[PDB]
């Protein structure tokens, strides 16, 4: 009924598919990819219809997740702050379709909704429990989670605790060792825990005031054996081992720590007024940060030193959200109006530092040390949003006009750490005034039902994302390698237009869905782009187009003659991106992907299973200038086509105990995902400092995942 493409996965579906990270969440979503395989920083984030990075609005309970951050080989943070084990559902929206979400959802939005006491407490009972134990063979990871919810008088409470402990996600390369000859995944030790607490008061009918507490800590100790013996030059060591045995990077060990703490208040109630029938608001405070610690034996020919690096990227967020719902009728049309405000107060800090100690004498090495440096002047970003949306029903038509006004103000704060960055480079030109942006983003959706089975829809939406502080103020000079990074204080915000139309058909014997989209991007921000020694500067791509077609379908085979419960389904996604400034393709566009399934479900749901077949085309349209091959050699690697088989099954051992099992990569095929390959080396610095054997970025071989869920 919604005039847009949105995919929802419930808590039960996540348990069925053994979803332990967002990479496994998008396994069978053909138009969404998650990268980061083989990278030190780990899982990067979502790629929706060729759009990834900070242009995807990732939020949990309305609170936006931190953006990416790259500041060299020892400073790289991704967007992996959410544990999928604490959500009741996840919604993937494509494009800035909704006015209720922020306009910075250029490529789409991924929304997480945490578990509520209602979905834990059984019907007819006042207390509930949920114990889960799971194992994943791909990363040798164990999961243990426990959730308890209760309902006493007019108060409801929920307490969730989960703990993960595992290792690195294995690749399908069969050679270990060190250097570029290592095709196995770098060893890792990953520990994670997540704490969720809710306490609500149901003081009236349709009214609830609640408290939310949330903590999440992820600790990964990595051994970058693939980087031993570096640096490398076009796939070969820069310094021959005959003269420097072991290279300049004798060994490199690291630790990445992710943290998210969130405290929130939410309130909704029913009102008898002419302005609204239902009002909800929430106030949240979130502290999310990433800590990268690097240790290495550094041997720059003349001296042996222990070189350490520390990087912290932190975001403190205050967000107030509101939404007032009013229902009324004007003549033959029924109206459903939703309006409100959204206030954001964001502080972003980034710090880099390092030390150097001589391994022969024990003395300090100032040449190998780094003082505390800030890449941006600790900005304070205030966002004010006003939105209104009306759902108008007239006969079989449904019109959804929308408006969202966004106001963004950024306040720089010059500190001594940032002044040091202005000293490292010879660029001391910084503007201490405030930068302001504002825009009205219209949105329109139309739905029409006909022939008792079909639905036509059209969607028009606009997106708006303001520049970040790193692009506006980041500066760095490398006289040794002959390049520098210039800030772009005149960078313009992104403007996008989304056009989408489609046809849906619902039957008792199955359903289908066809979608065609056309997205135009104006002033597409290309951070750290190489101009034309060398200059890296964030610039605006004036025009960019991404278009494609998505196909969905499901057939109930029992109606055509088959055992009841047997079904088949398919999902095919195609995209086409072009940079209209230079005519080059957009490398973030995934190849033609299709997922086909043959599944069975028992009549009472006691057991069932699904056989999945994923077919992906070979990548063809590649921009050679902006694509850096992971191995660094002259030849550029394009991912081939492949087909893989996966089998999921589920059995109810008891009325409370359910066993979910899944076998992946049945034929044990060595294959690559394009998003992992094209995203490994974003700027080209990794080709020399942390290269990847092409087999180390391959997907895991034959593996299984099993979990046991006890709903007491």
């Amino acid at each position, epitope marked *: 009924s919604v005039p847009s493409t949105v995919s929802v996965q419930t808590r039960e579906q996540l348990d069925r598919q053994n979803v332990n990270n967002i990479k496994e969440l998008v396994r069978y979503e053909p138009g969404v990819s998650v990268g980061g395989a083989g990278q030190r920083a780990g899982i990067t984030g979502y790629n929706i219809r060729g759009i990834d990075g900070n242009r995807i609005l990732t939020q949990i309970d309305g609170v936006e997740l931190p953006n990416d951050f790259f500041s060299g080989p020892y400073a790289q943070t991704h967007r992996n702050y959410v544990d999928p084990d604490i959500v009741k559902r996840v919604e993937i929206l494509r494009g800035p379709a909704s006015a209720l979400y922020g306009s910075n959802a250029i490529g789409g939005a991924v929304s997480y909704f945490t578990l509520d006491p209602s979905d834990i407490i059984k019907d007819g009972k006042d207390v509930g429990a949920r114990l889960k134990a799971g194992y994943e063979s791909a990363s040798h990871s164990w999961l243990t989670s426990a959730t308890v919810a209760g309902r006493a008088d007019d108060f409801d409470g929920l307490l969730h605790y989960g703990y993960r402990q595992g290792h690195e996600t294995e690749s399908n390369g069969g050679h270990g060792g060190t250097g570029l000859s290592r095709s196995e995944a770098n060893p890792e030790d990953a520990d994670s825990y997540s704490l969720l607490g809710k306490l609500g008061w149901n003081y009236a009918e349709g009214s609830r005031f609640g408290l939310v507490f949330e903590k999440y800590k992820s600790d990964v100790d990595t051994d970058q054996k693939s980087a031993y013996g570096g640096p490398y030059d076009k796939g070969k060591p820069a310094i021959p081992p005959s*003269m420097l045995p072991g290279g300049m990077y004798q060994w490199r060990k690291g630790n990445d720590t992710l943290t998210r703490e969130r405290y929130g208040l939410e309130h909704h109630f029913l009102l008898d007024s002419q302005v609204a029938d239902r009002i909800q608001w929430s106030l949240n405070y979130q502290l999310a940060k990433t800590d990268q610690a690097t240790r290495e034996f550094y041997y720059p020919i003349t001296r042996k030193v222990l070189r350490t690096r520390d990087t912290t990227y932190k975001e403190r967020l205050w967000v107030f959200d509101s939404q007032l719902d009013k229902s009324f009728a004007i003549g033959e049309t029924e109206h459903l109006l939703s309006y409100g405000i959204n206030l954001k107060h964001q502080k972003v800090t980034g710090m880099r530092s390092g030390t150097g100690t001589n391994l022969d004498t024990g003395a300090d090495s100032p040449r190998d040390a780094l003082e505390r440096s800030s890449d941006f002047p600790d900005p304070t970003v205030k966002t004010y949003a006003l939105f209104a949306q009306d759902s108008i029903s007239w006969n079989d038509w449904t019109f959804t006009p929308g408006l969202r006004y966004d106001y963004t103000r950024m306040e720089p704060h010059i500190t001594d750490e940032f002044l040091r960055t202005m000293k490292q480079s010879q660029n001391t030109a910084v503007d201490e005034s405030d930068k302001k942006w504002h825009r009205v983003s219209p949105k329109f959706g139309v739905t029409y039902d006909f022939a008792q089975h079909y639905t036509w829809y059209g969607q028009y939406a606009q997106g708006f994302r303001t520049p970040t502080a790193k692009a506006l103020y980041g500066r760095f000079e490398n006289l*040794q390698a002959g390049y520098h990074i210039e800030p772009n204080p005149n960078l313009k915000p992104e403007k996008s237009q989304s056009f989408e139309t489609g046809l849906r058909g619902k039957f008792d014997e199955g359903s289908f869905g066809v979608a065609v989209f056309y997205n135009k991007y104006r002033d597409f921000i290309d951070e750290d782009a190489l101009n034309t020694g060398q200059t890296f500067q964030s610039n605006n791509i004036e025009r960019a187009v991404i278009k494609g077609v998505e196909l969905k379908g499901r057939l109930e085979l029992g109606a055509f003659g088959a055992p009841q419960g047997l079904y088949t389904q398919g999902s095919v996604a195609y995209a086409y991106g072009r940079n209209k400034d230079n005519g080059e393709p957009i490398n973030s566009v995934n190849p033609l992907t299709g997922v086909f399934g043959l599944g069975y479900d028992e009549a009472d749901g006691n057991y069932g299973g699904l056989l999945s077949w994923t077919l992906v085309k070979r990548k063809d349209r590649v921009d050679d200038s902006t694509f850096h091959t992971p191995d660094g050699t002259a030849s550029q690697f394009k991912t081939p086509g492949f087909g893989v088989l996966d089998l999921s099954a589920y059995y109810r051992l008891s009325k409370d105990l359910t066993l979910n099992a899944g076998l992946y990569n049945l034929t044990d095929k060595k294959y690559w995902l394009w998003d992992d390959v094209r995203g490994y080396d974003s700027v080209g610095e990794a080709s020399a400092l942390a290269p990847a054997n092409i087999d180390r970025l391959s997907q895991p071989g034959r593996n299984f995942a099993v979990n046991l869920v006890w709903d007491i």
Partner: antibody
Amino acid sequence: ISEVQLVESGGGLVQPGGSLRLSCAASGFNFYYYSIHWVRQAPGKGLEWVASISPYYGSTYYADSVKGRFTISADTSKNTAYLQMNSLRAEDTAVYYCARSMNWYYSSPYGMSQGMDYWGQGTLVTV
Amino acid sequence: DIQMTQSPSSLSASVGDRVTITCRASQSVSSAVAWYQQKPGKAPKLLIYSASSLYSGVPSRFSGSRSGTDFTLTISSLQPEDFATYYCQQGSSSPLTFGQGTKVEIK
């Protein structure tokens, strides 16, 4: 402790207007990622930078006083730098030094490497 | 293009004295200024690089400083082996420019 050893050769009495080739053999680490510089000192005068070669980028640089007449090249297989001097004048007589820059491609930018830390003994060219 | 004016051209100095050699640039330049010591009949030896950093093995008597377009080389306690000619060199990458040179003699 001693990364490279630089030795110059090819210097001597060339009659004015003639040609002469100077070679700079390096013993030790290869200077493919470094910069090799030629510096000459006329008798009783100061140091004057004349040319430079960066093998990694393939870039060559020259002073105005020697532009067009001098050619600088490198081998990177013999670890030897060459300075082809043509149309020599009486003002070109000096002691030509071969020097290697401290800064190189993979040096840490926080190390602040700058200048030439290794020099040859020099060869006398008399025009 | 850029010029480095080094003053003085000669310093009469006594063992134990503190001497200062100043090098002034003709334009706006970065900190890429190096200092060299040359004795007669010998190749130049690098002492200070990046206008402040002491090269490994060079005695701590030598020191570098910067003030705008003026660069300073200082010897806190002159010693008998420090009587030579000193040159300031400007530039991180080519082209490079050397100073006129300052000869330090015995007072």
